[PDB]
Symmetry: D3
Subunit: 191 residues, 6 copies
Amino acid sequence: GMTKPKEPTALDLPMADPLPDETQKYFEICQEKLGMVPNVLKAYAFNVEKLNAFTAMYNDLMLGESQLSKLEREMIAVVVSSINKCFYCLVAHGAAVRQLSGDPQLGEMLVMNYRVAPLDARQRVMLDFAAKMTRASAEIEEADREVLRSHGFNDRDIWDIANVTGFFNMTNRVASATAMMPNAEYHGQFR
Amino acid sequence: GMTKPKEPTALDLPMADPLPDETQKYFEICQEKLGMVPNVLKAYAFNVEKLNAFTAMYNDLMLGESQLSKLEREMIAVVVSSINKCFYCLVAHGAAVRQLSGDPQLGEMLVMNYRVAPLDARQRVMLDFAAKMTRASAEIEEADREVLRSHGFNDRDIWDIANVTGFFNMTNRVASATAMMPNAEYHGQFR
Amino acid sequence: GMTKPKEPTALDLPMADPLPDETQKYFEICQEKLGMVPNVLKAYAFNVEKLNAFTAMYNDLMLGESQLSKLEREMIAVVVSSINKCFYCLVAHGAAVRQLSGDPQLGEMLVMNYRVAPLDARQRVMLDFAAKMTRASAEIEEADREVLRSHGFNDRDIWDIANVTGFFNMTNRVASATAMMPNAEYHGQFR
Amino acid sequence: GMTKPKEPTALDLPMADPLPDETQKYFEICQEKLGMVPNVLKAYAFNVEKLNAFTAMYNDLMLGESQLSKLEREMIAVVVSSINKCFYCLVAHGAAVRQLSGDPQLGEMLVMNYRVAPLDARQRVMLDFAAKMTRASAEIEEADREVLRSHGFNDRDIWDIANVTGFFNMTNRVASATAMMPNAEYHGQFR
Amino acid sequence: GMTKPKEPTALDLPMADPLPDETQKYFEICQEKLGMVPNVLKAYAFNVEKLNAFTAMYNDLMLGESQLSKLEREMIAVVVSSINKCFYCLVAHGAAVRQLSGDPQLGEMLVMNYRVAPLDARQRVMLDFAAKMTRASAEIEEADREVLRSHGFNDRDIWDIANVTGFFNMTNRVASATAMMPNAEYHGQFR
Amino acid sequence: GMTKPKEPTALDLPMADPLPDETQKYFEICQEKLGMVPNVLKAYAFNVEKLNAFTAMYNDLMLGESQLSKLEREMIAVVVSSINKCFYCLVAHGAAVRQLSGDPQLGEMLVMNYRVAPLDARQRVMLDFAAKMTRASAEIEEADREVLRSHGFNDRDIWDIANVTGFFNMTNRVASATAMMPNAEYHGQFR
Ligand SMILES: [Cl-]
Ligand SMILES: [Cl-]
Ligand SMILES: [Cl-]
């Protein structure tokens, strides 16, 4: 429709006007850390229990210990999002890849067709697995897991790839189903 | 192959045996309330923080406050899992639908082809929306959401449908990509 | 619709009230052999010529001579039905696999995602071929047939796999298109 | 490869030469009435019981009583075969449509893209329903059947459409999986 | 609709009545060379600049220098058209393959399912590449190009295969979207 | 692999260095008007006749007379390229949309998921029609065309939409099949 999209989603799900002090505080921290308050967080912020559960999982997967780099996990995110054609996540995580790699072209490549990127084999098979999980998880076999081991991932690493991949298969669906809008600031960042 | 499937997954992700006190307890409680310790929990239990993040989200979405019944969320779970052909989730959540509805055939119908179920339109459109997210969330439009509203769901309700559906799009992928095995007790229950 | 489904199909195709003596007799025999009269037979029973042709083919393929076991042919049936999401056939032939193997878990695995089953290679490639025939028969090549020979099937066996597979691609379509309902007794059998 | 395709299929399924008397006769009759012995029959003819079961079903569905014309059933056959890209069936049944309609272009249209054919709505919806069964029979709903009724088909008619369509979903798969070759005479007939 | 299709397309795009002398002249030449004026040309003939650009590209690709034979390029055309189910092009280029090969059966095979044709490997991998470009160009990799080189195509040849393939992915779409009708004369030619 | 991608494509198709005078000039003009020589042109430039045929068609469709704006045709280009996941075209034509609209986010939306764009219905239905051609042109019906007319497009306009859309279905395939690289300057422009 030729009307400016509602933010943070197309759902009437108020936050609402005086935020609870703890959520207000949290958002001050994001603003400081991030330069913004990501709209996915405003989306969950109508209920702090929900926001807490969302963020606890996001942080663990994206920022917690793993032998997958932060960038690597962001790369997975974008490839999943590209396959699901998730606008929110392509914008948000696209930015993250441009930031963490210092390579705007890599972000564009992953957003558009990851197969064109001149990646080392380790990163490429990581993304191929995520892709196959995204399109046809029921068809993943032991040989697919061995491909990952053949390029240096151990079983904990495979678990991490699977969870990051599965997580964006969740968040893409939620974002797209609710018409979740990415913060306008992302688009011009790290270009 | 022609070998007993490893449990809880085909990954070597030891727990290990002297469990942390808090995880031991969670499990004891599961056993006592559920008659078993669901295998998904043993898979995350190598890391209490990951287990914590998983369970908090699971419990909020499936058991936390909602205008969707517990049964309705499990129905969603089964329909998503059927489309993704997730053995773990079809077994565990199929069992849940059989349990909560006291109707073995309902479980079977949602496992196999939800369209045959003689549901009221409220529940049918809920499932149609989950199916559409699962297959093609990028194609969800305002009109799709208005369909839910036209059968009595409000926007908080739509949010809940969207999150339960995205969650099983994650957990199916994790389960399938890691060859996660459902507890054998499930198969013969609530028949 | 929230109305108990019509049996044996949603079509008004009466049998009708006094069955012809030969069909009545036949049904007495089924009841004895099977404990029930399968609803697919009631579906064809409005015309004995049609019932005769249906049953002649079913029997030859499923029960006639072959070096494929009875169970093996039932396994094919369920994998085809799973891919086509045929409720009738998944219920009827699912039961048959649970019965003939004495392994309820095997039936569930084939109904839900056959790839998880710890089968020997012979049975697994048999099912992979059926699957490929079901999704993309035009793409079957000589190398696909040689895979079967590489695991001990001769050309007569391949012919049998193809016909059993093709047959359920027929019966699934008829059942699903007519809203053919499986006999309630199947669901609880052989659990 | 660059070798003459084996007939009647790429399987070594000898007939063999001194045919059983009854099969000899059937074939003589075919030759006399059809100008040829269709290759599908030679493929089943290694086993008279299999041949018997095939022909009984073929003949009932395609030539037996129906309110669908013979041509209409062959049209169905061609549309199913086009979607499945079955060379044998497209050649043989394409020829049948050209023959029965006395309209070479009609055959070509149904082989290539049935949607371009300027059909009356009765025949178009019949074909749309066959196409939908062929692609996604699990998605057939009561509304789909009501469409057929709204163009003058009764429930016996729907049954017939469903069975002819399921039958070609079987025979396409058998033909394609075994590299069944249509008789070369077909190609130049009714042009 | 049961009304004779409009030619050359279903669009009201007049040529119009007195053709410009140069277009009239050109059409006299086609009629002489071809026995007809192909309807695709009448379609573009409302604007000679458009006709000029269309024909310049067609001629270069189909008739200009290449180490791909004329027939080979026509074979590509038909395989692309078959996958896109383009009636116009299947008829027009089907004829061309029957003509240039002097083998009606080869035309039918490519129209219906090219995989059945007993081609040498060079021609078969040429068509497999075109097919993969047609279904999933984003997935073409260096190894796919090396397959072509492994059967004697150099890089100029690969460029030609790609352009011929891409061109019919254009013309199929235009023809099908506008309901472009093939000249009736094609159907009976070269049988 | 982990090697700089070859430009302008991964094919060895030398231009070569002393360019023909007329191609030199074209390129000088591009540089002067565009700030660059688009890589697609260097790929065709090994053969002036091929380059001539490409550019004539490009220029007529994208820059020649139409009731579609230049921007509208580039929007079409981007939507087609997104569906085909064409990196070259998404970069180059994405940049064009950002340039002509003076709206960076519009480019991003059409690259990622055009459905989220708040377009007027005229432009949305234009894009829906392009998308449908791209995915399934054989399924375009008179009703699809009438939708365009109902938002003010005439039949010449529909023709133009159809040709621009088919053209990017060609150029995406060529680009992707040959690993054509977009000029690096594009990525950071009009942000
Ligand atoms: Cl129950
Ligand atoms: Cl004819
Ligand atoms: Cl801009």
